[PDB]
Nucleic acid binder design. Sequence first.
DNA 1: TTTTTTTTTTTTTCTAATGCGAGCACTGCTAGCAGTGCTCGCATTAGATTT
Length: 1151
Amino acid sequence: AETLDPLRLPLQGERLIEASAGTGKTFTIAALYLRLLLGLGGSAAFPRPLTVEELLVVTFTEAATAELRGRIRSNIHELRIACLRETTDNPLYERLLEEIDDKAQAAQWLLLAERQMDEAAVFTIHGFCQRMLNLNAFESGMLFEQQLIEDESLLRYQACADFWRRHCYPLPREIAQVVFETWKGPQALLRDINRYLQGEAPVIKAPPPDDETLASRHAQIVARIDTVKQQWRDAVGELDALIESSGIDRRKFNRSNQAKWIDKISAWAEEETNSYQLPESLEKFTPRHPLFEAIDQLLAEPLSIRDLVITRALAEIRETVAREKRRRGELGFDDMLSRLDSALRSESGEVLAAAIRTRFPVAMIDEFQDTDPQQYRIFRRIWHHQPETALLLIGDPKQAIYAFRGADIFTYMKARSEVHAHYTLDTNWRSAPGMVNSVNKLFSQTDDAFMFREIPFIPVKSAGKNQALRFVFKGETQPAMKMWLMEGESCGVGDYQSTMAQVCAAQIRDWLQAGQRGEALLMNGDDARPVRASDISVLVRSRQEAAQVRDALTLLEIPSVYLSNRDSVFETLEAQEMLWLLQAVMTPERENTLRSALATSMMGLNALDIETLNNDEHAWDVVVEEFDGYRQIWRKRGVMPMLRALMSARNIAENLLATAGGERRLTDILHISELLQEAGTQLESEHALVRWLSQHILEPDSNASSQQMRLESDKHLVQIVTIHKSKGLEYPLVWLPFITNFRVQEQAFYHDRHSFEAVLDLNAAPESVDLAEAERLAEDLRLLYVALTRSVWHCSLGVAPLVRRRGDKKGDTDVHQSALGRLLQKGEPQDAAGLRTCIEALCDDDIAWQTAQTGDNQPWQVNDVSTAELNAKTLQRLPGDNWRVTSYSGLQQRXXXXXXXXXXXXXXXXXXXXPTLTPHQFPRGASPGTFLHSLFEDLDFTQPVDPNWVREKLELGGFESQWEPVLTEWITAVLQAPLNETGVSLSQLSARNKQVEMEFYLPISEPLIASQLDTLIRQFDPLSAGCPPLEFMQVRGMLKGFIDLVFRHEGRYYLLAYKSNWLGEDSSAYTQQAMAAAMQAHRYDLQYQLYTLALHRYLRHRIADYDYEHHFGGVIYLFLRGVDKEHPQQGIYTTRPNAGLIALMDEMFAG
DNA sequence: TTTTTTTTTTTTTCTAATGCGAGCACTGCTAGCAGTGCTCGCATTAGATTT
Ligand SMILES: Nc1ncnc2c1ncn2[C@@H]1O[C@H](COP(=O)(O)OP(=O)(O)NP(=O)(O)O)[C@@H](O)[C@H]1O
Ligand SMILES: [Mg+2]
């Protein structure tokens, strides 16, 4: 191994950089990145400068991608600034500038990079394969649009039920009897194999042959026991044994059992008494005869169907899932990586690789100590060969804690084997000069602490920037590390979790109270800062642990967050209260479903409130009323407006904040509301939303957005976080209360030392159990390391004489099975006293141990807060006046009051009196009318009608052929009808004189008031005598409309508008009278007058020397259904604006 | 194609380990008996991760 200079590293081929924690591994990535952008290092430099989009960086967490992206952004910026200033105040940039040749061109490339930084390539693996597939699809053999799915547990469970249906339901009674014992149903089976369904499939040690069924195995074991049954039945009834005291004479009664126990094969369980007849058992207390020894053969291998079922099911469920996801064309996290691996694996995949070597002719993988077999197979297959591509693997093998997630150390060690070059970073930059020496001391206690020959520990040296770091608590400095030793002899896990959590809390509030007085300080040299509850972090292994920490820690009135919390809001009680409320406001009529909502802690009502409110009817009616207004807000304005109104009126948003802790509760309420919007839009119903909320109250899921928000950022908080979620992070003061604890793995899963392949032994044979438990322990060490390197100034950690074995007083302390204990005892069992001494041995000036003494004084001393007077400003002017763009439709609107305006007539008369090719029968609505119009839109008037053209319109319309012969006739009647007094046929109109569907915008300047208009209307209009004055609110703005048709005949223009409607009638129900009736009913009066104004202004605009009276021909409403070959008048209607009404009207809209 | 009623509660783990208690065989010490060494069985207690 050689030491590393960032600027000396050749970037060619594969390169491994290894170094301990806090050594700046992440920190160097920046420097190499810059170097790559500029093509620097000379001999060590890459052949050619690279573009930001060609640099691949792959990091472990989505958060890390964000951070590193930012840091690289900043560093590029600063370096550019320096290149323009030619000097800089930072040493690394200074050396870069010494290496750089031309500073100007350098600054140019940098600028360009800085711009490119948006698309800059940084990913995780699961974020990399994702992109890469969707990037090059053919090669990868993917669809182009992949719909992701994040819930793979439901598909998986589905498949497990499918298996357990086809491979279990067929079983006859007797085999089923055996299946039942090992697991009830697939709900449990899934729980057993679940870690093995996900990620790379394991290899199974000594798998059953492929052809063996359940009935086969079962018949086998049937006979295996049967032989012993006959045999024991034959040899029974004789004492040839040498009788011994300790073997108790009543042992012969056991034999009665066995000769009795031999009846049927139906049982899978041999008797406990059989253990007595083992020649290894008895001879310890007389070889007997062979079968006496055969029982030992029978009891040597546990009799089970288990391995076979886990094998068949594990192979099947995996496939089935993959197939169902193929059918939907979906994808998933493990499935992403898997699919890219497979894609490369395939013969075609070699093309694929070639593209990537083009896309990223370098890659820098960070946090590589966590690596998967698949991952390394990929990165190798891509970059292991070919020139001009580099590869940079960055990792500390000491830190790989993720084995549970499928990562494996052994494949890292493999890569470490196949890389010729190693590089090492010497100095820890992260933490105090004390903390370095502490850790070094603790891991130097034994030889080969990490108990992998390939993972040697080395001493590291603090930096010079950190030399002055110190932490002070009540004056004199506190040693960098303090181990809190528990008192007493034997300790169970529970006692330990109570006490140590508690003590941690007591210590934490002391630091705080001394932090508000400014006594305790985090000091770099003379500089300082008090210890806020922010800078403290508490690292725990699991969730239950963390809750155990918080409950005690909030009991002392210190607000605390848990950063790994995946719990979802809907699991809380506030979601439930929200349900009670929404459910009440929905139907306040029901006495019960309302009162329930009133009793909620959210409403904050006493028992006296609800009591009296059950008595006086007036109040109860008032409540019912207010909720009835809430339903209104609910229907009109949506949801969140309602809950807003309720919160204001009830004053709850304030009363919670008054209440202690209620701040959290209020955050939950607001959050839930915010979700009720997101689901509120997509669902149209008011009611289906209450449908929805319940369904989420039942299944909280895991999912991201419904996960709880942090309670408050106002106050600095205790950031209580799991180890794994602390990786790559930094925590100035750090607590490890429960670190002593351990978990002995009963499952047997390990790696072969030779092949380095993940091997599962479905059989419990103790060897493999050992081979695994060694792994569990080494991993626990790596947890300890990572946990200790997190701190900057101070880290405290608990130590206890923990006892796993249930015997009380021995001298057994299992602490040597703890990760930390083994480091204190150098892997030697001791007594609790020996524990205390071994702690005392290493304790000098850094490590300092105090006994763990429970105490309680005061939760904490807030001393409260002072604020001010405060007020909200209030708008004075109206928010805005009326400016609206409307059509005539925005005029009739609706009438609130005695008179309501509708197209239809309310009065109805019943009829008691008692060829389908007719116009009246045509469908109705906006849809049918839009079709009818759209015909005449392209339709040609001079040519007759082509029924084929009809059929292909109706076909497009979706209308059947029930119409085509019915239509093509009618249209001709339309086009052939003469019009007005001129007698014009629609047929006679040349496309030169046609104008189809004119859209116009007509400005209305000063506000247009109804009564100031309808008097002008009624005055000159005979038709406006009918019905009240039109009523529309004051409006100022633009007006829209579509002329159906405009055409000129005899040098004289016309205005044409089609109308259809009329559900009830066919015949003369269209007359001169009834047309004028309906016109007055739907207020087409104002409509045609308005158009005439528009057409008027448009002609006045277009036609040089235009005059209204000379050029204008009147207005024509054509009721399509109204057209009948029998009567020329029916369906057509014509009126002329007075020319005296337009004269004043136009002036009115002008001012 | 017509129409009436009525209100609420229930359950909850399994496996394993020890500690002791009861009963017995032997063996040594002063043929029987007391003790010890022993051994099994019944109840009680404890613990069940990590994106
Ligand atoms: N060369 C350097 N000069 C100055 N400060 C540095 C240098 N290298 C690292 N640091 C600082 O030291 C700390 C640790 O750096 P970091 O890059 O996280 O190391 P690391 O190896 O990635 N730690 P981890 O992710 O836990 O292994 C950071 O707070 C850096 O700012
Ligand atoms: Mg890092």
